[PDB]
Amino acid sequence: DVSLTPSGIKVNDEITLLYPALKYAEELYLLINQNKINFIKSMAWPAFVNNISDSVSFIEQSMIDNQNEKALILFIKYKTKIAGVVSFNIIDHANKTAYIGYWLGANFQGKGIVTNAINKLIQEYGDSGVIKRFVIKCIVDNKKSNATALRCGFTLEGVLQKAEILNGVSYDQNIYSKVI
């Protein structure tokens, strides 16, 4: 499979999902910083990304989790730029289940980048038999994330009451799955 390269997973001509590395810390940090105000509306961690050292620490932990298959954290490269992150936040091997996370900088939204990334990951891990069940959880009022889940052919399974806390406030999540 020529799409599986040493540096990452080639999705298409414009998108590669990069294995984390320290060389990305500066660009990743700058991207998060640029999007902090908007990102704080949908995720709990951006509020606390205050220096490049925070992105270094995130990269170091992500590499440890990747090594041990606890998670799969990938940095989305679109053309020449880091565009965001796509992940299996959790890989449950015993139950062949992966829980998916994602974000894109504002300048990279509206381009199908995360939908293409997710489709590629499901082909690679799902059609190979490693993962049987893929899961997306997202706050009910997160319009774009819900649209992405549906665009990727996931099915709504239910609503998880008060399941995600942002800034001390609990929000309901939709839980979506795609089963192989």
Ligand X SMILES: CC(C)(COP(=O)(O)OP(=O)(O)OC[C@H]1O[C@@H](n2cnc3c(N)ncnc32)[C@H](O)[C@@H]1OP(=O)(O)O)[C@@H](O)C(=O)NCCC(=O)NCCS
Ligand Y SMILES: CC(=O)N[C@@H](CC(=O)O)C(=O)N[P@@](=O)(OCCCN)OC[C@H]1O[C@@H](n2cnc3c(N)ncnc32)[C@H](O)[C@@H]1O
Q: Which residues here bind ligand Y, judged by CB under 6 A?
A: 43, 45, 49, 58, 73, 85-87, 89, 99-103, 136-138, 145, 164
Q: Would the annotation count 55 as a binding residue?
A: no
Residue ranges in 132-171 that form contacts with ligand X under rule CB under 6 A: 138, 142, 144-145, 148, 151
Q: Are 69 and 83 in contact (CB under 8 A)?
A: no
Calpha distance 124→10 (Å, rounded) = 11
State the amino acid at position 44 in one-letter form: A
Which option in ligand X, ligand Y, none does residue 110 bind, with CB closer than 5 to 8 A by kind? ligand X
DSSP 70: S
Write out the E strands in 11-154: 15-18, 72-78, 81-92, 97-104, 133-139
Q: Which does 144 bind (CB under 5 to 8 A by kind): ligand X, ligand Y, none?
A: ligand X
Q: Which does 115 bind (CB under 5 to 8 A by kind): ligand Y, ligand X, none?
A: ligand X
Which DSSP helix (H) or strand (E) runs through 51? none
Decide which of ligand X, ligand Y, none touches 142; Cβ closer than 5 to 8 Å per partner kind: ligand X
Site mask for ligand X (CB under 6 A), range 24-53, x = bound: ---------------x--xx----------
Tell me the two tokens of residue 177.
């799955």
Torsions phi, psi for 80 (to 5 deg): -95, 0
C-alpha separations of 74 from 22, 78, 94 in Å: 13, 13, 22
Site track for ligand X across 95-124, x = CB under 6 A: -------xxx----xxxxxxx---------
Round to whole Å and give the CA distance between 139 and 155.
15
Residue 97 annotated as part of some ligand binding site: no
Any known ligand binding at 129?
Answer: no
In the list ligand X, ligand Y, none, the entry touching 24 (Cβ below 5 to 8 angstroms by class) is none
Q: Which residues are annotated as a binding site?
A: 42, 45, 87, 89, 102, 104, 110, 112, 114-115, 138, 142, 145, 148, 151
